[PDB]
Design a protein around this ligand. Structure first.
Ligand SMILES: O=c1[nH]c(=O)c2[nH]c(=O)c(=O)n(C[C@H](O)[C@H](O)[C@H](O)CO)c2[nH]1
Ligand SMILES: O=c1[nH]c(=O)c2[nH]c(=O)c(=O)n(C[C@H](O)[C@H](O)[C@H](O)CO)c2[nH]1
Ligand SMILES: O=c1[nH]c(=O)c2[nH]c(=O)c(=O)n(C[C@H](O)[C@H](O)[C@H](O)CO)c2[nH]1
Ligand SMILES: O=c1[nH]c(=O)c2[nH]c(=O)c(=O)n(C[C@H](O)[C@H](O)[C@H](O)CO)c2[nH]1
Ligand SMILES: O=c1[nH]c(=O)c2[nH]c(=O)c(=O)n(C[C@H](O)[C@H](O)[C@H](O)CO)c2[nH]1
Ligand SMILES: O=c1[nH]c(=O)c2[nH]c(=O)c(=O)n(C[C@H](O)[C@H](O)[C@H](O)CO)c2[nH]1
Lengths: 154, 154, 154, 154, 154, 154, 154
């Protein structure tokens, strides 16, 4: 059987991170997690490109620009959506998720999903470096794996 | 680490605003907010193009024409959806959000989301220049940031 | 500031109407409203093309053919969906709305939404020429505006 | 006014039917209904192409192959989805409906929707040749009408 | 009537399997089921290509690479989504399902759905080789049938 | 009519920030917000003077020293008060607010209010860079506006 | 400031794993996770020593023998305790945890804690490669980090 997989060592890999500013007190923790994951897996900080955008809504168009760069192996999308009183959250979460997924397929390049989509503030805090881990770290680890996989698969 | 971000000074930037007429007593406040945000951040009012359309449904097709203009740096979509008795709201909100997001990716140009999607009239009022701010101002600020970002990223 | 808008006089404008037959006792009232709106705003009845299809599901593919005609300025989609016992309504409503919106963007031509999506028969009646107006008339009025707008915007 | 419509006589028309095997005891009734509708409206059984696939999930990719045939005037999609304990039904129903609708637009050819999307087994039975009719018959009648319409519209 | 169908003998058929690692204690059972289904239906294990990815989110981009291979007759997507406290599950499930379905249509190649989308852990266990069968085995059987069907249909 | 207003570009402006240490995990987020607001509006970081004090109680006396500097255009007061079991909160919040307001009038210089006065920890978190924004950013933006206004008004 | 930390690359590192047999259907998943974590972080499988013991009670004495080996850089303890009807669980969990912790200090060598201590079977399943991750993978990752840390700290 032919088996393809990615290892978790990040030597030589180059990453794009797109991180929104809305809910920054939590997003900033996700960004810290993503960078730490990359660096301590052997990636060089110099080989990270960080792009900041206003909100989750704006993540896809920026991710599209980064993913198109030949010298970017994978893009990590980072943001924090917390449900408000209206369905605004639903429409933004739907389109941010659809956009990133679509871009990944269109550009044949891994784009990982470190966007929290929480019903409550407590849930967001849980997932931004507390009791349920750090979604930035998780999305980064995924990107490492995917970039390594793609070195043979793509 | 390479870092890309947009400042909030709007000197020289050119914006398209697409604003629907349905719920105009609220949309008109959003438009006031967007224009004020642009002008007091240093954008010239002469460099704003405003397109009016009947309803939120019609925003995307108009936004598509504005975003295609080489002399428009970002488009701000402004409208007010308030849930009625039927699921009509859901289908319109879904497609206006999907359309704008898709156009932004297709055209590789920022299109920001200043469309209120409220369950109640009170919620719409809250977000149209009262207790929860002005969504037009917010979408404009996002567009300023994204246009500046794109000057280096695109 | 550059301002683009559409007037509501319909002299010289040419419209396509796609109207489904399911729930025809209500759809037929919507069609009456759309035609009346066009004619009394100055459009000629001879310059309307009406296409009939079985159900809301079939509206998009027919609208795609009409919208592609160079001598059609805008398309008005007319149908009546009423929720039944199963989620069938949801899947049809989702696709009809998505299809029409996507076609409008693909063809860069206004396609307006005169499709009722009601939970109950009473709600459909309300919106088909009774207490909540006539959605065909409303979608037609939107199409008049959009066609006029597009004479300068497109 | 220009008026386009399809008659219900099927002489000379050629149909593709894609029918899934999951819930076959019900799907098989839908297939019987579709064929009977075609034949008794004057279509020749020899001019029907029937393609069987495992489940509703697989209907779109097969329908795409049939709809691409120049000698197929319309495609009728036939399947039966019944909600189980998990949201699996929702994701399959969403994609089968989206796929078929998208293919119809892409290929500018009618593809009709004879897929039951029921919450309960009883509801499926009702719609597969019992008290609420036969959705295969209904989707076939729609395809007859649409194929005839398209002889002048396409 | 022309009738096209796929048999269930897998001699000579070549399959891609994309399997995520999240919830691996269950995914691994699905993978065992898929491989067993292929082999005991006559497919050679040497003719299977297995690609591992981090999570369900990452399945589509990898499936896109496998499905593009001329020597892969069908792709089987295998993963396990279990609802957590937030809507994160919904956004991932929606995009994994959409992505796979879209890729199948774009590449005109069968991609089958062996992704569990469960509300509870118990439901996932039920579907990963216990009381409700093995979804990997089911998705593999579907792929066998579809690959055989496509030998005449494509 | 004579109209005086302040723009939001901060080129050349010089700001004092007084920030308390009590509840620092939240105050530090407010400080980050204030600085970012100033810098991305065109103010130079070098032109910010930051003074740290133990608690909200101590903010006024320090703000008085900064506001008296000729080369400080506006002062931004930043702190986080959260109600405890006793009325201690009320007396501190009352005097911090009275002091700052009084100083602003006495010194005829804008002093803005970025002090959270929350009943609960959750409310404080909401206002320190999460779902209700960042009060530091808001107080900074106000100070930019006021300093610009005062260039003509004072 | 002197800062010591461990990276997550495992090249050259040698690990001991002690895994109990009680609840093996779950422990075996933990063992799979630990080995996968080591190997995909760059550790060689040949440099892993696995010791099997009957129950959690027996883990410490075996871990003591492995930790005493000069060619073992860290030991990972893996087992699954699930509360029964009596306090038996408490006494075993207390002593296995105390023993491992004491040995780590006595031998000045990292010994990590991949022992599940669950109140219910469902909780154990959650932590053995399903919804709450894989405790073997987590304990292995910790051991990688600690072994690297100790290369400079010890
Ligand atoms: O990242 C975000 N998280 C949120 O919870 C959230 N909530 C909101 O109500 C909201 O408007 N946004 C901002 C949104 O992403 C856009 O930046 C804004 O619509 C302007 O385009 C965000 N953005
Ligand atoms: O902008 C809108 N906000 C609403 O709340 C709303 N509600 C409605 O019931 C509604 O029909 N519309 C109009 C809609 O956007 C379109 O203009 C109309 O369907 C014609 O295409 C709107 N449009
Ligand atoms: O226009 C429709 N309104 C409805 O409420 C409705 N409800 C239904 O259950 C239903 O099947 N349809 C028909 C549907 O639009 C299609 O014509 C049919 O599925 C055949 O393709 C319709 N069509
Ligand atoms: O046609 C179907 N109707 C259903 O109710 C149903 N329910 C299910 O749980 C289910 O898995 N399927 C099968 C599905 O369509 C696919 O064949 C399967 O996922 C393999 O790709 C179907 N398929
Ligand atoms: O396959 C998965 N099943 C799940 O239930 C699940 N739940 C989660 O909360 C979750 O984050 N994921 C991971 C997801 O698929 C991605 O790998 C992750 O978002 C990084 O891109 C998964 N992935
Ligand atoms: O900034 C503060 N926030 C608080 O919630 C809080 N609560 C208290 O009970 C409290 O004593 N303080 C401290 C207070 O501001 C003074 O530093 C203290 O009284 C010494 O003068 C503060 N200070």
């Amino acid at each position: 059987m032919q088996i393809y997989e990615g290892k978790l060592t990040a030597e030589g890999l180059r990453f794009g991170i797109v991180a929104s500013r809305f809910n920054h007190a939590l997003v900033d923790r996700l960004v810290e997690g993503a960078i730490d994951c990359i660096v301590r897996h052997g990636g060089r900080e110099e080989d990270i490109t960080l792009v900041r955008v206003p909100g989750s809504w704006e993540i896809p168009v920026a991710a599209g620009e980064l993913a198109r760069k030949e010298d970017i192996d994978a893009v990590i999308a980072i943001g924090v959506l917390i449900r408000g009183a209206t369905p605004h959250f639903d429409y933004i979460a739907s389109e941010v998720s659809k956009g990133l997924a679509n871009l990944s397929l269109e550009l044949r390049k891994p784009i990982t999903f470190g966007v929290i989509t929480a019903d409550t503030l407590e849930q967001a805090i849980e997932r931004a470096g507390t009791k349920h881990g750090n979604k930035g770290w998780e999305a980064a680890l995924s990107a490492i794996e995917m970039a390594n996989l793609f070195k043979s698969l793509r």
